[PDB]
Write a protein that binds this ligand. Structure first.
Ligand SMILES: O=C(N[C@H]1CC[C@H](O)CC1)c1ccc2c(c1)Cc1c(-c3ccc(-c4ccc(O)cc4)cc3)n[nH]c1-2
Length: 269
């Protein structure tokens, strides 16, 4: 057994947050870089079960568009999660403020996003907090869904389970989560992806939250796509947003039907 391989030099901080911090670790013998999350078990009444679900969910995942899970080390309060390192950075940082990015890149990123989501959904799981900062890129620039601290399984033994728990991030959350007591999980993730598409194509977020009390939301519902934020988006991908960002979740397009959308299969464009 090669000596010292177990040793991981904690090179630098990747991105701190409410949880704690995520440092970049490089193998002492192979120099294999990785990402280690530090979940502070501090306090005892809103920290335990939190990470326990996040870990069992990771033990299931396995797709080229989902951050890879390696292992987890326990030690009192300091829990260590070992996940794939993404030198690419966040999709967020590839979005030019107020401009977005070249339409071809967006289509490419959207494709990988759908691949990852189709997968998660396939095995009955919903991320529930899809946004540019949770979408990572690696060396080759391949999109990776990351952060399953909020995910929850919605299908077990072929039984779907309606959700009622509110979570996510207001600008990316779906409207039925603010107006209904219960809702289907799949459609909520589709709305998220939809908001991410617009962010990529226009560099700005359509609204603070999907509620009529919000200007831009009521305008979009009225289809005032002129001059407003959707003015920057070409009609092809704009047609797809009309289908995704549909209020009634039951009338909202399904992923299987997005794969058939015109702009989705338009070469380069
Ligand atoms: O955006 C980044 N840097 C910016 C560059 C421009 C400067 O202006 C500011 C910093 C950046 C670079 C490299 C990064 C990240 C973020 C996040 C991240 C990660 C990373 C991977 C997975 C998970 C994670 C996965 C699953 C789960 O259940 C919980 C957490 C969290 C964090 N690895 N490598 C990186």
């Amino acid at each position: 057994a090669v000596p010292f391989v177990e040793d991981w030099d904690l090179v630098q901080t990747l991105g701190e947050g409410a949880y704690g911090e995520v440092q970049l670790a490089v193998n002492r013998v192979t120099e294999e870089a990785v990402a280690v999350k530090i979940v502070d078990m501090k306090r005892a009444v809103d920290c335990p079960e939190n990470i326990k679900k996040e870990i069992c969910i990771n033990k299931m995942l396995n797709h080229e568009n989902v951050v890879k899970f390696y292992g987890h080390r326990r030690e009192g309060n300091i829990q260590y999660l070992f996940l794939e390192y993404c030198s690419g950075g966040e999709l967020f940082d590839r979005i030019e403020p107020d401009i977005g990015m070249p339409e071809p890149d967006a289509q490419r990123f959207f494709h990988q996003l759908m691949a990852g989501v189709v997968y998660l959904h396939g095995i009955g799981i919903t991320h529930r907090d899809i946004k540019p900062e949770n979408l990572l890129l690696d060396e080759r620039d391949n999109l990776k869904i990351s952060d399953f601290g909020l995910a929850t399984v919605f299908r077990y033994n072929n039984r779907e389970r309606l959700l009622n728990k509110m979570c996510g991030t207001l600008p990316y959350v779906a409207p039925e989560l603010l107006k209904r007591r219960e809702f289907h999980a799949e459609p909520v993730d589709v709305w998220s992806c939809g908001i991410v598409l617009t962010a990529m194509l226009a560099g700005e977020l359509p609204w603070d939250q999907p509620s009529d009390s919000c200007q831009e939301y009521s305008d979009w519902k009225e289809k005032k796509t002129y001059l407003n934020p959707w003015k920057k988006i070409d009609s092809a991908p704009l047609a797809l947003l009309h289908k995704i960002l549909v209020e009634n979740p039951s009338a909202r397009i399904t992923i299987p039907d997005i794969k058939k959308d015109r702009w989705y299969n338009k070469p380069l464009k």
